[model samples]
Target: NGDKGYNGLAEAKEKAIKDLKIYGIGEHYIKLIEKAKQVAAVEDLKDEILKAHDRF
Candidate 1:
């Protein structure tokens, strides 16, 4: 279900933070990376869709 899908995304991000910390990543850098993943990732996807629309 879509609800479970969103829940899984949260769980996956939590695990990624934990795992990266275990590898000694700085908290500040981790926050920046996660922010990019959460924000820039979607923006990139939207741009890709726009590019595809142009091609179409």
Candidate 2:
């Protein structure tokens, strides 16, 4: 068991989700990642995590 880092946005999200499953993080939020389009650690210098999705 070790720690890793995200290379990029898309690349990061992809592996992040898979990693969660691999490690059994058991976070339902990761399920949110599956449908989310826009997500990040920090862009607008904010907390509580900013996310975006398709509005219908």
Q: Which candidate is the best by lDDT?
A: 1
Q: Name every residue pair that clashes in candidate 1.
A: none
Error of 2 at 11 (Å): 1.0
lDDT scores of the candidates, listed in order: 0.48, 0.44
> Per-residue lDDT tens digits of candidate 1, residues 1-56?
11333665455555555655665555654564345445334344334434444564
Relative to the true structure, candidate 1 has a C-alpha RMSD (angstroms) of 10.7
The regions of model 1 sitting more than 4 angstroms off are: 1-5, 36-56
Q: How close is candidate 2 to the true structure, as a TM-score?
A: 0.37
Clashes of 1: 0
Model 1 lowest lDDT segment of ten: 1-10
Model 2: residues >4 Å from true position, as ranges? Answer: 1-7, 32-56
